[PDB]
């Protein structure tokens, strides 16, 4: 069964229940929340209107009682967010992390693939 989302920046999305471990390995939401501080400067810069949803869908993926795998982002949204936000990371000498490699996510939502295409 699913657990409430405790990460404040991941409230008020279309869903509000999750199930750890997330798509980046964290068993604890608080650990996900600390790691997310890595991105708060991008979040207030505002490189992408989708960054918030995207990060949340990875760090606290959607959970339903009816489906027994976590539901993360589709690759389309990942690519769109990366294209807007990686250049800002690059200005400061950083790069889009392997942990957020868009190839890890299903390319689109399907019969075969379940994922959130987001806002
Ligand atoms: C992302 O993953 C693929 C293999 O899954 C790899 O070829 C690629 O170089 C990785 N990194 C990217 C695209 O930056």
Author numbering: 44 to 162
Q: How does the study describe this entry?
A:
The Norrin mediated pathway maintains the blood-retina and blood-brain barriers and regulates angiogenesis in the cochlea and uterus as well as neuroprotective effects on retinal neurons. Our crystallographic and solution studies further reveal that dimeric Norrin forms a complex with two copies of monomeric Fz4CRD.
Similar to mouse Fz8CRD the Fz4CRD fold comprises four α helices stabilized by five disulphide bridges (Cys45–Cys106, Cys53–Cys99, Cys90–Cys128, Cys117–Cys158, Cys121–Cys145). Superposition of all Fz4CRD molecules in the asymmetric units from two crystal forms revealed a well-ordered protein fold. Structural comparison showed Fz4CRD closely resembles the CRDs of mouse Fz8 and secreted Frizzled-related protein 3 (sFRP3) with an average r.m.s. deviation of 1.2 Å over 115 equivalent Cα atoms and approximate sequence identity of 35%. Interestingly, we found that our Fz4CRD structures form the same dimeric assembly in two crystal lattices (r.m.s. deviation of 0.7 Å over 238 equivalent Cα atoms from two crystal forms). However, this Fz4CRD dimer (front-to-front) is distinct from the previously reported crystal structure of mouse Fz8CRD dimer (back-to-back). Size-exclusion chromatography coupled to multi-angle light scattering (SEC-MALS) results showed Fz4CRD, Fz5CRD and Fz8CRD exist as monomers in solution at 50 μM concentration, in agreement with previously reported SEC studies of Fz8CRD and SEC-MALS analyses of MuSKCRD and SmoCRD. Taken together, our results suggest that the CRDs of Fz receptors exist as monomers and may not be involved in receptor dimerization; multiple GPCRs dimerize through their hepta-helical transmembrane domains.
